[PDB]
Design a binder for these strands. Sequence first.
RNA 1: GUAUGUAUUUAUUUUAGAACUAGUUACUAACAUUUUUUUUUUAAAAAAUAAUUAUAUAG
RNA 2: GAAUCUCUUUGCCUUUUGGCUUAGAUCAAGUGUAGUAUCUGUUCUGUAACAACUG
Lengths: 48, 300, 238
Amino acid sequence: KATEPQMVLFNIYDDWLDRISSYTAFSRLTLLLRALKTNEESAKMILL
Amino acid sequence: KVIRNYPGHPEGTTALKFLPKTGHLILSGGNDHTIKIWDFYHDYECLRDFQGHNKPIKALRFTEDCQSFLSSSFDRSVKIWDTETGKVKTRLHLNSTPADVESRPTNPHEFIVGLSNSKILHYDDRVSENQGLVQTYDHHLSSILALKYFPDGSKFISSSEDKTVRIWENQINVPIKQISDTAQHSMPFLNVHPSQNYFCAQSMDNRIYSFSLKPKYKRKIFKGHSSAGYGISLAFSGDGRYICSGDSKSRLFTWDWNTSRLLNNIKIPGNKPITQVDWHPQETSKVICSGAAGKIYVCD
Amino acid sequence: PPVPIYVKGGVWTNVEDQILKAAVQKYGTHQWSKVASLLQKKTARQSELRWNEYLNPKLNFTEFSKEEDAQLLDLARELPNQWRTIADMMARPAQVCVERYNRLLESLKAGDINPNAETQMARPDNGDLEDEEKEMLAEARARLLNTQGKKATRKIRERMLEESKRIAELQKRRELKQAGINVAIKKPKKKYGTDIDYNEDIVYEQAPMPGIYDTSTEDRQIKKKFEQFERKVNRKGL
RNA sequence: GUAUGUAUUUAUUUUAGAACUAGUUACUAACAUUUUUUUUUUAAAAAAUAAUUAUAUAG
RNA sequence: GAAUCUCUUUGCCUUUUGGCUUAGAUCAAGUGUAGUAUCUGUUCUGUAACAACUG
């Protein structure tokens, strides 16, 4: 949707750093992104 | 055959439309710098006129909630009219003269404007950070002609002078579908059939082609009329079995959508041609045609 | 996505014979690679063999006359097993000559490669078709259709696009004429300094070198007729 | 990837049909980076071997 | 004898192949993703008459 070259900030560990320490949060994000790079619709339906 | 006529506009009518669901009152923006409402019942006179722009009026649309509608004109400007009180909510001034405007079904605040410098401006009523301009589109090469939003509210269509058709998602600025052929011609009018499995376009080679509204958009042919000069509207029955078009020779043509057979061919008083042809969805078998003659004809 | 056919010698079917005939009619005898590209599973040399040995109408496939048959026994006696020379002496294909010689002197497994496949009879086809043969005839009709170059096809496209561009350019003028603002038509621009506009002047006007007779009243009658036509096109519009 | 071509007007000149559905072919696209030598039986048996790659292509 | 309309052979050919050389030369076995093309299958088929006014 962007109409202008810009820097946008996100926090990719959503709220995990309260209850979950950071290293398991990175490996969780590894599992999710490997799923979305592997099958891309089965995993997107698994979240949804 | 025609029943009754309205004292429409000196020097011609350039756009007229109905209310989309109920249709109890119609409007036309005219060549003599005026936009007027009429009732389709109980009086047959003019409920509410208003002076609009300084130049003649090019196009009109509707927000689907119908409290307000759109206006676009040859003075390089677009305005939004409250159809009840009559006051203006936004006035907007452009670079080039605007060819066509359209409003979103889901929200009244999104609308798209397509200019004659091959750009589609996508403004917004609510946000006022950059004069409402959310996004502009620039994949067309030449001055675009007509643009018609989907009834579903997600994607929309545009046509242009450079003999191609593009389909966009709502604010992506990437055409997901390019309908382009070698022997194609440009179409000054688009419309979507009420069954929503097809949208059809009135092409410049005096025909009407029809494409899918489902994915893998692909191309029946409605012929028997001469409309190469001017660029003429087309409407559909409120059941979805009839398509009706105008002509350069002051007669309208009604085809059966189910078989593409020309059923009837009714002429209209006035030497001048007829462009805007609109159907009443509630009351069946009722059309209204009008053109450069200026009067507003209610055909059966 | 087709796996590669490295050895393309097969059995000539009906489809490939007919595509070879309708390819030789258009492409001609001496371009063989362009013929054999049209029909897959065969080679340019095997297309040449299938023409020069079997599909050619000049070739002589009849029964042998008695003088012909005695000529064959005598020539096969004089020239020991030189069958191209003998078949040249008889104006008949050499395979016909060899098989008829075997018939005179008389009185294939599966999984073998047949070398003589171009000289042998065709195989008629099953009733519907195979899928690859549908694809073959589709691309063969598509390649036998086209007779144009790149420049000429682009010229077709450019003429259609300039035509529709003129139509849009007149459409906007007619709309502004209805509005009451008369935009005159702009002219195309000159690509060089002495490029000629053809409404300004009669460009290389040659007068008809007058004779003995008198042409004043006929001049006046023509001038009247042309002025009246221009006025009628101005008012009513042709 | 070049060559080469095409598009970019404002300072106003007097008045037979309807619906549902998915893969097979071609062609195109400066757009994108899962080892070696065997043996043997009819999956199991043997033997073996060694601090890590280019932004470079045009008629 | 002669004109009008209409059909056969006979003439006419009237959209009726516009250079050269070493046939000018070479070769048509790549994966994904994407665009374009086409191709199979299934189901369903208000009008008339009478009484009154002519504004």
